[PDB]
Fold Replicase.
Amino acid sequence: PMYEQFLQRIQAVRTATVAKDISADILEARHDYFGRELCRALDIEYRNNVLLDEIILDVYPGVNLMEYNVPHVTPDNYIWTGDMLLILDYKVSVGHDSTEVTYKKATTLILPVMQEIGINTEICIIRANPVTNQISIVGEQFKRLFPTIPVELNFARFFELRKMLLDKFAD
Ligand SMILES: [Cl-]
């Protein structure tokens, strides 16, 4: 259905301006596909994106939430071991640039308020290279809890949809 919905939009599109919205949605679905598969292999609960406020309340329900300035920020997921909060962001990319951008933003926006509240937090980004299927991890505590990441990844359907868009608008 995913693939067919995209195929129908790709068939229908006429302008590059509208096509870019299809390209962006295909990129997000590829991201979501990695997330679901990564959480399956890691045997953690899949969440699409959770607000920081909701993470704080799930870990520390007694927080005096209104005493703090919680930025509106939606990391893809999180792991609460019992002692450490692992903020988890997924990336699918052949470069690391977007990983670095998200890392910095998650660092300036999340870690300050977690420090005041007293929650030990780490930013973690897991990146799949869609061409090579190699997994890159950033986050030291995450690497010690999962040195084995048994993902079974196939991005070809996403590559096909985007190739179709590249072919239609190769002007
Ligand atoms: Cl992504």
Remarks:
- Residues 16-42 form the longest helix (27 residues).
- The longest strand covers residues 84-92.
- The pocket of chloride ion is lined by residues 31, 91-93 (CB under 6 Å).
- The chain has six helices and four strands.
